[PDB]
Short mmCIF file of C-alpha atoms and ligand atoms in Angstrom, two decimals:
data_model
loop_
_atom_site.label_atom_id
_atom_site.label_comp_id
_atom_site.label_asym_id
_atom_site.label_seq_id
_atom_site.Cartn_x
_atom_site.Cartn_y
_atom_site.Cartn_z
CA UNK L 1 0.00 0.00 0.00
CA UNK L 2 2.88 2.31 0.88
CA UNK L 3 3.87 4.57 -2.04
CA UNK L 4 7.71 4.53 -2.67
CA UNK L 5 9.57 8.00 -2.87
CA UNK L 6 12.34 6.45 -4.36
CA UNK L 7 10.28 5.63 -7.62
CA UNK L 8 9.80 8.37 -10.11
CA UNK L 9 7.61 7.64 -12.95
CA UNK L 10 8.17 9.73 -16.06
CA UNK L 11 4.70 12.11 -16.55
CA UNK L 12 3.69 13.97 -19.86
CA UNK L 13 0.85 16.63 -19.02
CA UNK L 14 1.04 17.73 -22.74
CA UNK L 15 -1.42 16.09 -24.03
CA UNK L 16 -5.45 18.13 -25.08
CA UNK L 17 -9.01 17.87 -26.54
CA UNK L 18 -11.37 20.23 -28.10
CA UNK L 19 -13.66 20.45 -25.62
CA UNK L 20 -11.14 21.89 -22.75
CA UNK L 21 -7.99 22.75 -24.82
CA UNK L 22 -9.52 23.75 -28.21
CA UNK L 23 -7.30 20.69 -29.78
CA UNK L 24 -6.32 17.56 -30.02
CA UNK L 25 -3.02 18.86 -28.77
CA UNK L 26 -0.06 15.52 -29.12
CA UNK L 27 -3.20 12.86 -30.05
CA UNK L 28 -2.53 15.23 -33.47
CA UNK L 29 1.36 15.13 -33.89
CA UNK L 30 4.21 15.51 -36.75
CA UNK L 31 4.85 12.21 -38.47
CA UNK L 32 9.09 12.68 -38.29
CA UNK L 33 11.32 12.69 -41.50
CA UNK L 34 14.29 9.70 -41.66
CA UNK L 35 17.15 11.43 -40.57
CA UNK L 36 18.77 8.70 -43.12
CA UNK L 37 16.50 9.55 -45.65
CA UNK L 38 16.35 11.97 -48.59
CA UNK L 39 16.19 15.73 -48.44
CA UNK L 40 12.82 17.22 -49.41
CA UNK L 41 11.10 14.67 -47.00
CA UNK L 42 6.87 15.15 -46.77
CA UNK L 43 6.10 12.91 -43.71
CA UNK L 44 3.03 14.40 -43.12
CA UNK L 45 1.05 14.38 -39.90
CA UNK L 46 -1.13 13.02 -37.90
CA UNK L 47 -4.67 14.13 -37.38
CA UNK L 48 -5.75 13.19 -33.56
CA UNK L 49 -9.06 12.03 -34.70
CA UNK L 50 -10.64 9.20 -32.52
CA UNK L 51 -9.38 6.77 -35.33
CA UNK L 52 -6.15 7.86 -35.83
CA UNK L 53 -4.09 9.22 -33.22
CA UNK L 54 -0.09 9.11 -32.76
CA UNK L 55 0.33 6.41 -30.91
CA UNK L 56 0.71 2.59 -32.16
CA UNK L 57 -1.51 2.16 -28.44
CA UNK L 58 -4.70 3.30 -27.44
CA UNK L 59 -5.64 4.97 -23.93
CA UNK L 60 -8.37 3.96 -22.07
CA UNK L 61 -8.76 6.88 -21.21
CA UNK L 62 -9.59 8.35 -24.75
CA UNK L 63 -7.90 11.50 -26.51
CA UNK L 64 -7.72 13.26 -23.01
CA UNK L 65 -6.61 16.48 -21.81
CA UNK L 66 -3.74 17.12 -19.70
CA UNK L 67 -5.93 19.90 -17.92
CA UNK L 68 -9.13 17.91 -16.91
CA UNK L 69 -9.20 17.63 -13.30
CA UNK L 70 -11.55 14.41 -13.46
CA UNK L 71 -8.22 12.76 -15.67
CA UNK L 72 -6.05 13.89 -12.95
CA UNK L 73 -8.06 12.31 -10.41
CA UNK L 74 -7.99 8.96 -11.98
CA UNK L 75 -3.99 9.65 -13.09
CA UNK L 76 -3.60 10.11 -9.40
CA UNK L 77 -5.28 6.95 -8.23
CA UNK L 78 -2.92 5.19 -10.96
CA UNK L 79 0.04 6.04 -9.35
CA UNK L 80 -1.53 4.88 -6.15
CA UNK L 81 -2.30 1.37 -8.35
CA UNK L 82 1.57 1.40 -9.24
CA UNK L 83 2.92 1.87 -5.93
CA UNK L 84 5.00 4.93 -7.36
CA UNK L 85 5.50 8.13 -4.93
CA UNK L 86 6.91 10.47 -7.30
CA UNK L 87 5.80 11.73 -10.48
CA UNK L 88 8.40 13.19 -12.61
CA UNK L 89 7.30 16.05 -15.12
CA UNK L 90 8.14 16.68 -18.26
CA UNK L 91 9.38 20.78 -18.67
CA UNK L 92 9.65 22.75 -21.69
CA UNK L 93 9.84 26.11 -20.25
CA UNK L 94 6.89 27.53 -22.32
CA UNK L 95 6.50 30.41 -20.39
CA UNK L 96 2.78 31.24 -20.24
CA UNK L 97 0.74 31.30 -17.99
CA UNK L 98 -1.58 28.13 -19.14
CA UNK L 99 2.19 26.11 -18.21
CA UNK L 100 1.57 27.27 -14.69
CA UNK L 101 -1.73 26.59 -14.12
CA UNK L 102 -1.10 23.24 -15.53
CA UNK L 103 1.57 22.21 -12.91
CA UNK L 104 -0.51 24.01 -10.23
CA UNK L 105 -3.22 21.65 -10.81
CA UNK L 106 -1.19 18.47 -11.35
CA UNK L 107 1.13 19.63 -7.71
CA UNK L 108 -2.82 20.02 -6.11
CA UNK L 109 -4.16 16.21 -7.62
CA UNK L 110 -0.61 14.80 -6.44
CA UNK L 111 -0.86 15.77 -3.21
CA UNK L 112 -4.66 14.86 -2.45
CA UNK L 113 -2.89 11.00 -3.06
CA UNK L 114 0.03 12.26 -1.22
CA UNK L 115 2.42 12.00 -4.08
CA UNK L 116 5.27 14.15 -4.78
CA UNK L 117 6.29 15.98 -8.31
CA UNK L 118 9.40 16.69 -9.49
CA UNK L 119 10.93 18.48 -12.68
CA UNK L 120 11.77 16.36 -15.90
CA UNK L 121 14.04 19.50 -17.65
CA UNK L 122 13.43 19.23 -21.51
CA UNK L 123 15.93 20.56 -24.06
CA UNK L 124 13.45 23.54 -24.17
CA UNK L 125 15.02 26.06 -27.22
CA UNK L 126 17.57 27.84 -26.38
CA UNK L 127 18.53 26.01 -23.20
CA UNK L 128 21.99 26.53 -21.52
CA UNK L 129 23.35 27.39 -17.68
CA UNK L 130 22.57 30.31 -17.35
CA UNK L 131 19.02 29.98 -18.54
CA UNK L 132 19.03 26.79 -16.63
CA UNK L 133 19.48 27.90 -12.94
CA UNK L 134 17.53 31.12 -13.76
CA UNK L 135 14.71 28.42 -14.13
CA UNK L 136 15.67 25.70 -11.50
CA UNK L 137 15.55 29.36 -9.39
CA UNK L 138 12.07 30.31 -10.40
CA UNK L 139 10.86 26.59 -10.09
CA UNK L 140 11.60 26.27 -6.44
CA UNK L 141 10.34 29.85 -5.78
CA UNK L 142 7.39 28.94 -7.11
CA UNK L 143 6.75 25.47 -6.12
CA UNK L 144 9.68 24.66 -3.41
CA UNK L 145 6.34 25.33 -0.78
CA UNK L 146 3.89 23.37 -2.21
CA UNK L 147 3.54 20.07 -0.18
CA UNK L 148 3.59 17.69 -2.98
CA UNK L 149 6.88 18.92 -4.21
CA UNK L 150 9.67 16.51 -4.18
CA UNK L 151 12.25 16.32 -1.86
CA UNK L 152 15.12 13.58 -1.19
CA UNK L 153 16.47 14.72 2.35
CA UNK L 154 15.85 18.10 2.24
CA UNK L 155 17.00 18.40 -1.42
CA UNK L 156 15.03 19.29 -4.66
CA UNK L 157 15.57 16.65 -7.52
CA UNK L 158 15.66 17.60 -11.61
CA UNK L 159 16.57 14.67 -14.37
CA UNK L 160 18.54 16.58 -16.59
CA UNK L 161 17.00 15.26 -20.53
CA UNK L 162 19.89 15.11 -23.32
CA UNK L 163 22.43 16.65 -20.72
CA UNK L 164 24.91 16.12 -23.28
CA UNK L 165 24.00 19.11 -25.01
CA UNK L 166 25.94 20.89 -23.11
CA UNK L 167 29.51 20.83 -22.51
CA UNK L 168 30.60 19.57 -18.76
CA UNK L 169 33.00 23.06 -18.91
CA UNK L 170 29.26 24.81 -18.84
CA UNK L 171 27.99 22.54 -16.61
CA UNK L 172 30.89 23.17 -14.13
CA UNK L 173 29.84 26.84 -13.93
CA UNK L 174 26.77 25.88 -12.43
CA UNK L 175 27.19 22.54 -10.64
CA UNK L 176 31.02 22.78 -9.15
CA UNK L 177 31.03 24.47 -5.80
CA UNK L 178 33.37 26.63 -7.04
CA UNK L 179 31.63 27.20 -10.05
CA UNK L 180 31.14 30.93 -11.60
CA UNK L 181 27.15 30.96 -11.24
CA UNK L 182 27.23 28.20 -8.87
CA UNK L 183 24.23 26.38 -7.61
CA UNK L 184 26.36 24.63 -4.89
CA UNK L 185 25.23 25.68 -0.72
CA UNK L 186 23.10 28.04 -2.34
CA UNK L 187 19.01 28.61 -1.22
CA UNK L 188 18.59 26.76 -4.76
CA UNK L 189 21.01 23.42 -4.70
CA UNK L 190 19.43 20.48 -5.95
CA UNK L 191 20.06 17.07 -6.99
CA UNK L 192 21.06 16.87 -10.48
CA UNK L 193 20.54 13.89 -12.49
CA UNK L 194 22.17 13.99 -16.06
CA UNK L 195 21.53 11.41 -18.96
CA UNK L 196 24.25 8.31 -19.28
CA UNK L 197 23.79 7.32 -23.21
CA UNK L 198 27.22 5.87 -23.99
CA UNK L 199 30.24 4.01 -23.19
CA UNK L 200 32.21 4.54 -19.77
CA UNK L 201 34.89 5.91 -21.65
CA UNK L 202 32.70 8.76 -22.74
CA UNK L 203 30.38 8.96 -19.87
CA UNK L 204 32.71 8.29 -16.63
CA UNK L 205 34.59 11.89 -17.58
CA UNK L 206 31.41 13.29 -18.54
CA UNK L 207 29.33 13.09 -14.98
CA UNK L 208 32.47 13.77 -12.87
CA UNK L 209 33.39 16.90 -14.93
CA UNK L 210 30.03 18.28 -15.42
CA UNK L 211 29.42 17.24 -11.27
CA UNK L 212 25.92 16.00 -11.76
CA UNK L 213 24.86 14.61 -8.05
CA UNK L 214 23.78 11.30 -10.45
CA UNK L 215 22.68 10.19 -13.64
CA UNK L 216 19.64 8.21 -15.31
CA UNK L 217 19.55 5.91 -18.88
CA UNK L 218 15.85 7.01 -19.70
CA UNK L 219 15.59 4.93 -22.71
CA UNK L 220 12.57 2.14 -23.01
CA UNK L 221 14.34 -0.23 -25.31
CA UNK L 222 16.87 -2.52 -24.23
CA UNK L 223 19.92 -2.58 -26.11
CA UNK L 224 19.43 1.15 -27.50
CA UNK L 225 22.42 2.68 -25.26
CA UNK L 226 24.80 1.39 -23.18
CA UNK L 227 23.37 2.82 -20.46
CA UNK L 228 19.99 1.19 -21.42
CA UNK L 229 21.58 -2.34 -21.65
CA UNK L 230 20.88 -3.57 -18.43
CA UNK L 231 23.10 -6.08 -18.08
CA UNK L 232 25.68 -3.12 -17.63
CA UNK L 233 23.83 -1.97 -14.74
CA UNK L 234 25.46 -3.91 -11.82
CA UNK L 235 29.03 -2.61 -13.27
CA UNK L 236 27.42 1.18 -13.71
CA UNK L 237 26.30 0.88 -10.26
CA UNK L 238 29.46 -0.16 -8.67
CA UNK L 239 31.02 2.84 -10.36
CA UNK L 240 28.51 5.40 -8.89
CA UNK L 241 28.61 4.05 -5.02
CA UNK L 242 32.94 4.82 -6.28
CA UNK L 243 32.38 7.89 -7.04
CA UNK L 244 29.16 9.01 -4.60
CA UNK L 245 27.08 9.56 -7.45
CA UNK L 246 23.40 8.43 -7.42
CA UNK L 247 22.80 6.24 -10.05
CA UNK L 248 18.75 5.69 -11.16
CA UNK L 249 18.15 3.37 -13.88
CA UNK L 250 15.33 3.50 -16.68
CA UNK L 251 13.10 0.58 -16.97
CA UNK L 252 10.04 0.22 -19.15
CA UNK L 253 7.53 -2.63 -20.36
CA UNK L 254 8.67 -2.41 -23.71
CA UNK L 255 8.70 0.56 -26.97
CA UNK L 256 7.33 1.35 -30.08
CA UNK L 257 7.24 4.94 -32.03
CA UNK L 258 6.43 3.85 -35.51
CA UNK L 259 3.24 5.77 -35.98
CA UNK L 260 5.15 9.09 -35.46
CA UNK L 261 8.73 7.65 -36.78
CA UNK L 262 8.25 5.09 -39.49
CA UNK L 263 11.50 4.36 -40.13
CA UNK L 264 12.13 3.87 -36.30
CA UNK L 265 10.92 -0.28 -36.10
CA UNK L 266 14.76 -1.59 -35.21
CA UNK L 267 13.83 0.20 -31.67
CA UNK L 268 10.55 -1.82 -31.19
CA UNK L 269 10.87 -4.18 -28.17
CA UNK L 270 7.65 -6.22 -27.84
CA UNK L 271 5.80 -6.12 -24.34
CA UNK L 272 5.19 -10.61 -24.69
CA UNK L 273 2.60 -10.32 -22.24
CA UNK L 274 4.74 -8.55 -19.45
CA UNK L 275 7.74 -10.32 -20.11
CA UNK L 276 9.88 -7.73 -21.14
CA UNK L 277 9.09 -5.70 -17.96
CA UNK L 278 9.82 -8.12 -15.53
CA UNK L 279 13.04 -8.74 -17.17
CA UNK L 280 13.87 -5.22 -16.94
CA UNK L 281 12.88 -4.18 -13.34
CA UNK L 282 14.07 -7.30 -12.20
CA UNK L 283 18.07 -6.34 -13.13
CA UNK L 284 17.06 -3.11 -11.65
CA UNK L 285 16.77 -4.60 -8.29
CA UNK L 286 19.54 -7.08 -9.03
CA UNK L 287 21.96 -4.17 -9.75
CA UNK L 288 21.21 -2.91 -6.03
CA UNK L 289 20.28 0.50 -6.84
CA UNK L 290 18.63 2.71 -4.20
CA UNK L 291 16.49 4.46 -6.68
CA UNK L 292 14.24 3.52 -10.05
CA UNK L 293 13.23 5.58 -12.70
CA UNK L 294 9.79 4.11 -14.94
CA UNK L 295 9.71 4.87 -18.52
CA UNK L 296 7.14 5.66 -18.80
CA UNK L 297 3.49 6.59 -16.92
CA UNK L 298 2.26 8.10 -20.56
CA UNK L 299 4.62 8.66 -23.47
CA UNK L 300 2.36 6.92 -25.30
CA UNK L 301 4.29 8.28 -29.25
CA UNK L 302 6.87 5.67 -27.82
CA UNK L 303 4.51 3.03 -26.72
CA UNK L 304 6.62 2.84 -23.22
CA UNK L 305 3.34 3.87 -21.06
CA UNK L 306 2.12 1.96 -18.20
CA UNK L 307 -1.24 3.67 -18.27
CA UNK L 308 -4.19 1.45 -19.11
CA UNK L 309 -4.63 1.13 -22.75
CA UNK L 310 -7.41 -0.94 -24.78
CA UNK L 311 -7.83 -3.19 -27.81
CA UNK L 312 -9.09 -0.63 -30.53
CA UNK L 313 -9.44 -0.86 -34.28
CA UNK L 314 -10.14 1.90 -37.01
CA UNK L 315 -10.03 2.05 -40.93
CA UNK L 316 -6.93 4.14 -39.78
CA UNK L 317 -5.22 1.53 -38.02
CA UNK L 318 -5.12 -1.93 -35.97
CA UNK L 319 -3.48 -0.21 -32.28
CA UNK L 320 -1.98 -2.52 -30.54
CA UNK L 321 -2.79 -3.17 -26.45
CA UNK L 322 -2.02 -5.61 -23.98
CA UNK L 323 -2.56 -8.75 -24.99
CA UNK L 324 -3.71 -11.69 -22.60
CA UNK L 325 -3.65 -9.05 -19.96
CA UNK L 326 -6.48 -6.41 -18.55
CA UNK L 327 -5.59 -2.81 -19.50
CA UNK L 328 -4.57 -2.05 -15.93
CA UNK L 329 -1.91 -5.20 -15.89
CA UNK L 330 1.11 -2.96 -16.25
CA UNK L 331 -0.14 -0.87 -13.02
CA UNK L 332 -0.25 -3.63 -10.74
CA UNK L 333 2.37 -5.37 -12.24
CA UNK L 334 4.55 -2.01 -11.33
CA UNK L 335 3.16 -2.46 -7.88
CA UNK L 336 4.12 -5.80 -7.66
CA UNK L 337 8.09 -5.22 -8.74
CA UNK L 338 8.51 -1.98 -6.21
CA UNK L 339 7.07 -4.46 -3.49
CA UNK L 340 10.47 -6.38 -4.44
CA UNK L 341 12.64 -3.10 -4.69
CA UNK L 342 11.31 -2.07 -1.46
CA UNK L 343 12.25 -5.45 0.18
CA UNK L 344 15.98 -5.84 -0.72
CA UNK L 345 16.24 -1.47 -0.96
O1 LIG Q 401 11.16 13.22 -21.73
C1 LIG Q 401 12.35 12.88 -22.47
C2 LIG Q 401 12.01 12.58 -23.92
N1 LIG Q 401 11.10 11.44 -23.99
C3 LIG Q 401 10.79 10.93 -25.31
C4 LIG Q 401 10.10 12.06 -26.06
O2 LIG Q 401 8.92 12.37 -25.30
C5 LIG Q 401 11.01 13.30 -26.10
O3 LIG Q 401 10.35 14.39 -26.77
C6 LIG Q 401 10.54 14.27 -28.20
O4 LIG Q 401 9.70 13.29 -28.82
C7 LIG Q 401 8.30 13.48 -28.66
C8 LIG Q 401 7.51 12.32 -29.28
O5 LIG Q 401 7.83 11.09 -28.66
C9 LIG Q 401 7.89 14.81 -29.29
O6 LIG Q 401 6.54 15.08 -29.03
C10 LIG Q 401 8.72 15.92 -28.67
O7 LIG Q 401 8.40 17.14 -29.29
C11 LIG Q 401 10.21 15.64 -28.81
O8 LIG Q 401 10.91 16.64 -28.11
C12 LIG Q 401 11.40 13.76 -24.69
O9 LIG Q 401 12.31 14.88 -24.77
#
């Protein structure tokens, strides 16, 4: 029944309908053009009607808006299904003032379950250090009180998307404790958790020169990274208790994006009716980690949700959905795998 706060579940609130948002906002969504491919590329797009929408799943839920409360009541109660204390937001620094009330309203549904939010940073346009801590800055000011807001003793927490971006002699300005527009024993220090994609030979300099508190994998599909092969993750481990970094790996019940990237199917990892998940959470826990990261509650372009989804067809397209299992499986089954994280923590 207890909710673990060491299990942060990756949470897209970007998604809209006519009747609250005026659109189909993400259900709609840019087919992408084959970065292989040629170069006047027409992908097209897709429409967000109730027979075609861009995902190869389909929610239970319907073509839903990120906004409506009665959706956030029932996302809520999900979590509380899954066992997972801490939902972690995606943030694209969009500036108005519909952004805000957005998080306002997810902060209020979280805490009514007494789950906590935290920040998923986004390579939002334009994004660098500076930029960066004059958000992590406003953030906290603005949500640091709120009672659902994450803490991990007495420390905010941000995963740090495509970290690699940006150059660890940038990152030292604001993550060092000596650094120029430090962060460090400030009113605003935080947990940092940047993105391991590739070999230690790469990464190892990477996260001790840019002196992220930890890092993540993110990535769904086994096999995709190295740091989304798990059977690197007892070695990646061992590395971070070296080197007191925190080290939170990505696990998800499987991935598929080719409605929105056609070209993408060498990424699809089947779910075989759960299989795949328990694999993956299972050499979680086996790598002793003291943290999780779930890939994801609702990215459902990449088919990595957990969310309930059902068997739907249209003259659009044959969506897949769970198989021999109810739509819910993938909550409980989450539920059922942080029971086992929780017992050997
Ligand atoms: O949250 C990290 C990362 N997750 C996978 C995507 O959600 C990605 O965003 C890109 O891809 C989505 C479609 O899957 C697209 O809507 C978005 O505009 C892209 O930025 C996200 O950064």
């Amino acid at each position: 029944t207890e909710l673990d706060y060491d299990t942060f579940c990756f949470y897209y609130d970007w998604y809209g309908s006519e009747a609250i948002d005026g659109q189909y906002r993400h259900w709609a969504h840019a087919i992408a053009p084959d970065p292989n491919g040629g170069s006047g590329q027409n992908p097209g797009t897709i429409p967000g009607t109730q027979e075609s929408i861009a995902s190869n799943f389909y929610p239970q839920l319907g073509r839903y808006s990120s906004s409506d409360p009665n959706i956030l009541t029932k996302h809520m109660d999900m979590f509380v299904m899954a066992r997972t204390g801490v939902l972690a937001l995606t943030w694209w620094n969009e500036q108005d003032e519909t952004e805000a009330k957005r998080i306002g309203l997810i902060l209020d549904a979280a805490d009514k379950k007494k789950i906590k939010v935290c920040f998923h940073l986004e390579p939002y346009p334009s994004r660098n250090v500076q930029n960066l801590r004059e958000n992590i800055v406003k953030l906290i000011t603005r949500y640091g009180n709120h009672p659902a807001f994450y803490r991990k003793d007495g420390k905010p927490l941000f995963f740090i998307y495509d970290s690699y971006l940006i150059e660890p002699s940038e990152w030292e300005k604001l993550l060092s404790p000596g650094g120029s527009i430090t962060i460090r024993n400030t009113a605003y220090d935080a947990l940092m958790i940047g993105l391991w994609t590739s070999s230690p030979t790469v990464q190892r300099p990477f996260i001790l020169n840019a002196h992220f508190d930890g890092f993540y994998t993110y990535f769904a599909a086994t096999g995709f990274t190295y740091g989304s092969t798990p059977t690197n993750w007892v070695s990646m481990q061992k590395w971070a208790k070296e080197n007191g970094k925190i080290f939170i790996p990505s696990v998800g019940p499987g991935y598929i994006d080719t409605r929105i990237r056609p070209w993408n199917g060498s990424v699809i990892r089947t779910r075989t009716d759960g299989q795949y998940y328990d694999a993956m959470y299972r050499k979680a826990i086996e790598a002793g980690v003291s943290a999780i990261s779930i890939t994801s509650f609702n990215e459902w372009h990449e088919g990595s949700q957990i969310e309930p989804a059902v068997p739907y067809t249209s003259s659009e397209f044959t969506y897949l959905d769970y198989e021999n299992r109810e739509p819910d499986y993938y909550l409980t089954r989450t539920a059922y795998w942080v029971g086992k994280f929780r017992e050997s923590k």
